[PDB]
Design a protein around this ligand. Structure first.
Ligand SMILES: CCN(CCC(=O)O)C(=O)c1cccs1
Lengths: 300, 257
């Protein structure tokens, strides 16, 4: 019962809303998306019909303000904007709903897929990874590089994921070189969980956000981060039972949702083989192991 | 990248570099037990750390005590190697520290990289050369200091003796690798070639005999003969029938991965 109206749809485009998508024709009487479930972050994403390199979107939470989409013919994209006049916004939404010019967020009652993919994802953590403090919503696209990718250029348009590097002084205590390289528990539990993330929920929110940006935008840096955060856990001998059980749930829903036809670009053979069959946690991810073996046995 | 045939002259330039060979760090004898199971017994080993330009050899003796009560010894041996190389680099004055460390086995790359994180400007490289540094323990004076050791010890040698007074580093390294390859291929025959003429001795302060320039040519020829003879014996090849190119290609081919 929250709504993102569109001023118009002047260019033919595939519009995603979370895991859903639909095609809009050039100058189609399309005026947005209604019945968006309150209580979760959402992502509205675009791929232009005439140029599939234009792949971009906005993370938002309808609890934080009244958002709409307007096409900018100068910058050639669908922009998210915030409407500060509540009564104007309500009156616009009411007119478009009465004229039935909005698509309804097509949630099946039984279907927890989106909650399962965003359980730990919070808009305030998104806004620290994607820095544009003047907006309450966050723009992401296919080409944005990560702070890590930029080290190995524009720092204002980067994805500020937590840097994970197994062969770094941060990961390896002087005097514990073999110990820390073969068992990443110090790096996971002391440096990352206690030190940087403060708790497993923030760590899982960043992992889930990385996966979603990888899947929805084909953002390569995000895919790297998702796999790095999985490998950091799987490569740790000492991980709390609750975190292992939660990771198995997280990864199961991610593998379930991944389109079969993108499995070859979105899944890293080395990391998955290592995590499921060689790592400390090879026997801790039963649900993920079963869906991977049944859906993607060619990768394994 | 990788040190190979294409960049071979780089070994003899004025950038300090070390080869590290870990093949003699963890050494065992394998034997039957009373109950007819099999057991290993470790023997003293060594890290072979060589400057190919100067001949300086940093032989770190690995005493069997370092294995006591440890598991996964073949994995530990690589990390112990890296730990000791990183201790040697920290022990050297800054102007003596290597710019590159070339490991003979690619399994040494991660252990050495991780121990050398404090030295981001020291390059850790593999090599496409098949070097015969495992045969270091065929050099009698090296084998003797390793086996006599009762505790961890570092011993310093010049593995070229005084050759650099007369020959270039390139030639010295070529001579060393030919001698070590011959000793690796047929130790007894190689030692007989080196130790045959009793009138040519090993100086107290040297590893190899005091050959004249002409005698070194004869010895080098006898070593290449040994290697080719053993290649014929191994593969059942009539070597008398081979051409000069075929022969050069066979002796070279063995020192290339
Ligand atoms: C015998 C000399 N030698 C072969 C063995 C060695 O010295 O490493 C060489 O000049 C080359 C090795 C690899 C490319 S050229």
């Amino acid at each position: 019962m929250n709504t993102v109206p569109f001023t118009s749809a002047p260019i033919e485009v595939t519009i995603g809303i979370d895991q859903y998508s639909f095609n809009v024709k050039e100058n189609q009487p399309f005026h947005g998306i209604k019945d968006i479930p309150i209580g979760h972050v959402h992502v509205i994403h675009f791929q232009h019909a005439d140029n599939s390199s234009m792949r971009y979107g906005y993370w938002f939470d309808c609890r934080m303000g009244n958002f709409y989409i307007q096409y900018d013919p100068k910058d050639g994209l669908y922009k998210m904007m915030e409407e500060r006049d509540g009564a104007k916004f309500e009156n616009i939404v009411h007119n478009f709903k009465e004229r039935q010019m909005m698509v309804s967020y097509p949630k099946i009652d039984e279907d927890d897929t989106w909650y399962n993919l965003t359980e730990f994802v919070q808009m305030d953590k998104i806004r620290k990874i994607v820095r544009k403090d003047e907006n309450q919503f966050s723009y992401v696209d296919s080409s944005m590089t990560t702070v890590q990718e930029n080290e190995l250029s524009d720092p204002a348009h980067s994805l500020n994921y937590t840097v994970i590097n197994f062969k770094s002084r941060e990961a390896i205590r002087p005097g514990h070189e073999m110990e820390d390289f073969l068992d990443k528990s110090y790096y996971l539990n002391t440096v990352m969980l206690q030190g940087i993330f403060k708790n497993s929920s923030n760590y899982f929110g960043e992992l889930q956000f990385a996966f979603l940006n990888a899947m929805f935008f084909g953002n390569y840096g995000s895919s790297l981060q998702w796999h790095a955060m999985i490998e950091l856990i799987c490569s740790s001998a000492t991980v709390p039972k609750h975190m292992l059980d939660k990771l198995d749930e997280i990864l199961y829903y991610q593998i379930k949702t991944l389109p079969e036809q993108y499995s070859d670009i979105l899944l890293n053979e080395r990391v998955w083989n290592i995590c499921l069959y060689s790592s400390f946690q090879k026997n801790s991810l039963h649900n993920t192991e079963k869906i991977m073996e049944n859906k993607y046995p060619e990768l394994l | 990248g990788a040190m190979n045939s294409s960049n071979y002259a780089e070994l003899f330039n004025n950038d300090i570099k070390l080869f590290v060979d870990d093949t003699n760090v963890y050494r065992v004898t394998v034997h039957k037990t009373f109950e007819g199971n099999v057991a290993t017994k470790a023997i003293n080993g060594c890290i072979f750390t060589l400057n190919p330009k100067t001949g300086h050899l940093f032989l770190k003796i690995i005493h069997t005590s370092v294995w006591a009560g440890q598991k996964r010894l073949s994995q530990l041996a690589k990390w112990k190697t890296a730990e000791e190389v990183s201790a040697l680099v920290r022990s050297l004055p800054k102007e003596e520290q290597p710019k590159q460390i070339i490991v003979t086995r690619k399994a040494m790359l991660d252990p050495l990289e991780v121990h050398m994180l404090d030295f981001p400007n020291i390059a850790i490289r593999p090599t496409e050369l098949r070097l015969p540094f495992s045969a270091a323990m065929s050099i009698d004076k090296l084998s003797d200091v390793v086996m006599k050791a009762t505790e961890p010890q570092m011993v310093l040698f010049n593995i070229y003796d005084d050759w650099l007074d007369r020959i270039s580093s390139y030639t010295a390294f070529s001579r060393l690798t030919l001698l070590l390859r011959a000793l690796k291929t047929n130790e007894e025959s190689a030692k007989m070639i080196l130790l045959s003429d009793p009138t040519i001795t090993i100086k107290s302060y040297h590893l190899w005999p005091s050959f004249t320039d002409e005698q070194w040519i004869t010895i080098e020829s006898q070593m290449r003969d040994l290697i080719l003879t053993e290649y014929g014996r191994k593969y059942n090849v009539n070597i008398s029938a081979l051409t000069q190119t075929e022969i050069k290609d066979i002796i070279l081919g063995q020192n290339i991965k």
